[PDB]
Each structure stands twice: as C-alpha cells, then as structure tokens.
Design a protein around this ligand. Structure first.
Ligand code: FES
Ligand SMILES: [Zn+2]
Length: 406
C-alpha cells in the first residue's frame, strides 16, 4: 500500500507584464484569473503570496484532511514567475523547500540536500510558464530549482486565436520552448483550452489533432481548461458587446470527448472513452510495451507495463536527444540519454513491489546502451526522489542523477 504524490500548489506575487506596452494591464495576466474561486489562488491572496506561509498552510490542510504528505509535488502557478527578479525566484523556491523541511537552511542547495532525506519529500517540482518565457537561461534556473515538470501556457496552438494572457505568443515560441525543455530532460505539459475568441469547435478539434501529429509538439500531457465567461474579467465585456460567444454545454462536452478520443498512448489528459494515461491507471500479469515517436529532432521512447486489458501499471519516458545541452563534465560522455519520467502507478518512487521501476530503468539502460550506443543515462529527478536512484547506482551531477552505461 503505497501513498500517492500530493500536489502542493502555490502562487507567486502579482508581477508587471513581461513586455513593455502602455495598453497592457497593471499586472501580468494569469490563467488562474479565470479560475478565481479555486482554493489555491484564494489561499495565495490570503497569504499575501508568501511562499513559506502558503506551503506551510497547504501542508497543514492536507494533513487535516487525512491525506499523506510524505511525497509532495510543488507546483508554482502564475506563468510569469521566471520573468521576475532572480533573487525573488531563488528566495521563493528556497522558502518552499524550507517549509517542506521544517527547518531553515543556509541556502537553496542545503535546503534541497536536506529535503533529499526529509519527511515531506519533494518528488517533483512543476513550474507554469509562458512559451515566450522559456529560454535556455530560464530552463537552467529551473534546473537550479529542482524542476521536473513544466506547464506551458499554450492555451491554443494558433497565432490568430486570442489568448487569455496579455500580448500573447506565437506557435514558433511553443516549438522552441518544447524543444529546449525536452533537450534538458524535463516533462512537458500544455495548457489546452477550447473555446477561445477567434476560434471554433472544428478548429479546436483540428488543432488538437495536429498537436499530436507534428514533431514540433506532441506534449506529454494536456491540461484542459474549458473556456467560459467569468464575471469580473475582460471576456465578460467581450460577451456583453457580443464580440465573444461561448460554446453550449453539449458542444463543449462533445468537443472535449472528441479531443480525448484522439490522444496517443503516451499522453496524459487532466481536467482543471478516453484511452490516455489517466484513463488506464489501475487478470493478466503486465508485459513491457515500447512506443517510439519523433520529437524536436530527437527520438522519444515511451516504455510501459500493461496487461491484456491494456491497463497501465507503470511508464518510463526515454529521450534520444538531438544534442547534449546538459553539461555533465567529461566523466559522462558526449552522448547521453535522458529519462524524462519514471512513474510506477500510481505514484513516484522516492525511498531507497517497486520492481516495475527497476525493470523499466533496466530496459531503458539496455536500449540506450545497445540500440543507440549511448555512453550514459541522465535523470532529472526531484530532490526528494534522488535517494531512490542512488540505490540504483546513480550519482548526482549538476542536478541530474547520472550513471555510466556498461
Ligand atoms: S494590450 Fe498591451 S499588448 Fe495587447
Ligand atoms: Zn483520460
């Protein structure tokens, strides 16, 4: 009986718009502006957006619900966090880790090191960011934070469709950001919302179909935000004037269903029949399955453990990179494979049964060594999970859990 990974979602402070525009609003628009009554955003405002206080409060709430806190995924919401002052960012993350640890460390590195064997393990850290705010520097900082997953605010993959954030972004930005995120071994999720102004159900469906056929994209998951008119927002005005008309409930539901119907086996759908990862969660003993698909000039290998009824027991994402962007310093070769995710259902492995993870990793190492002739494997693990990989011969190098293939 193993306990699930509990989400700890916190928001950063209201920030000015990343771009310079006299017409732009006082503060940068967040997706959460259209989910205002969410517990986490209201909680965020009630804490004056203090990281430590938010995390401590969240931990207390989760503990009071009777839910486990031994495995935690930190989620940094806002989408504009990486555009803030550097000191603020590092101090925020450090505050989060301090709140998880129960002790105040002398630095971020010490906080992470401490969290490696703390009670509240941070087995994952997810950061929301905009496609145009996701370059090499931002990514390196995210590595410094101990980031394992990124949610890109794509919203919808078309330049002529109005976004819910100010200014907006381009498809090329999404492509570049996705490429860079993959090349650094991060998990990539897209914020996906049908019903945006200037679109149509047919267009949303077509784009939803294209996002899984074009090698530039193909995210690990979609976060479905059914677009709707929220009072106190600009969309409300757009609806008053008649400039925007939302889909009927049956239309939206049908569209969501059609979207779920066309997703590849390696995709996980979550809402803010379906044959995705989440709708196969969990007869016969599971066997090992492999599914390859091209992405960002590299190869993606989706390994999984599934039984005769196609029920999913575990999965591993192994990337054969287009280049070696992570610097690992001589000891680990010029060509290195990346394990972007290891998930033995329904949870994440942190401590150091559990055999499925070992088997998945073994197959990954085998494929990387024999078929693609790679020198080593690198795993961008959450800090609180590092120990697990340490029990399997991996050692910490520049934020990655690395092992030389032999
Ligand atoms: S209002 Fe500032 S960019 Fe559209
Ligand atoms: Zn599903």
């Amino acid at each position: 009986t193993i306990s699930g990974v509990t989400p700890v979602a916190v928001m950063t402070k209201p920030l000015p718009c990343p771009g310079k525009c006299i017409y732009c609003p006082t503060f940068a628009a967040t997706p959460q502006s259209y989910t205002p009554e969410s517990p986490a955003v209201l909680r965020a405002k009630s804490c004056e957006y203090q990281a430590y206080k938010q995390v401590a409060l969240r931990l207390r709430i989760i503990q009071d619900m009777g839910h486990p806190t031994d495995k935690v995924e930190l989620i940094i919401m806002g989408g504009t966090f990486l555009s803030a002052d550097i000191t603020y960012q590092y101090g925020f993350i450090k505050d989060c880790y301090d709140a998880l640890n129960g002790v105040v460390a002398g630095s971020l590195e010490e906080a992470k090191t401490i969290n490696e064997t703390a009670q509240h393990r941070c087995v994952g850290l997810c950061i929301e960011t905009r496609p145009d705010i996701c370059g090499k520097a931002e990514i390196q900082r995210m590595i410094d934070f101990g980031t394992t997953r990124v949610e890109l605010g794509v919203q919808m993959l078309d330049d002529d469709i109005y976004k819910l954030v100010e200014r907006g972004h381009r498809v090329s930005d999404v492509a570049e950001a996705t490429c860079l995120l993959r090349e650094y071994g991060l998990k990539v999720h897209y914020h996906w919302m049908p019903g945006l102004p200037g679109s149509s159900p047919e267009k949303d469906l077509a784009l939803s179909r294209m996002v899984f056929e074009d090698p530039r994209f193909c995210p690990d998951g979609l976060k479905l935000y059914p677009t709707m008119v929220v009072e106190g927002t600009i969309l409300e005005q757009w609806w008053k004037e008649g400039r925007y008309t939302p889909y009927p409930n049956g239309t939206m539901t049908g569209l969501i269903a059609d979207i779920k119907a066309l997703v590849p086996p390696y995709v996980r759908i979550s809402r803010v029949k379906c044959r995705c990862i989440r709708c196969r969660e969990y007869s016969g003993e599971p066997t090992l399955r492999r599914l390859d698909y091209p992405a960002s000039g590299g190869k993606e290998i989706f390994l999984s453990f599934e039984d005769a009824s196609d029920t999913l027991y575990g999965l591993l994402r192994l990337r054969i990179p287009c280049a070696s962007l992570p610097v690992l310093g001589q000891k680990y070769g010029a060509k290195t494979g990346l394990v972007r995710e290891l998930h033995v259902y329904g949870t994440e492995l942190s401590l150091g049964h559990r055999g499925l993870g070992r088997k998945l990793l073994a197959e990954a190492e085998c494929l990387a060594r024999d078929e693609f002739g790679l020198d080593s494997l690198a795993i961008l693990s959450g800090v609180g999970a590092r120990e697990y990989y340490r029990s399997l011969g991996y050692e910490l190098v520049a934020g990655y859990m690395c092992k030389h293939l032999d």
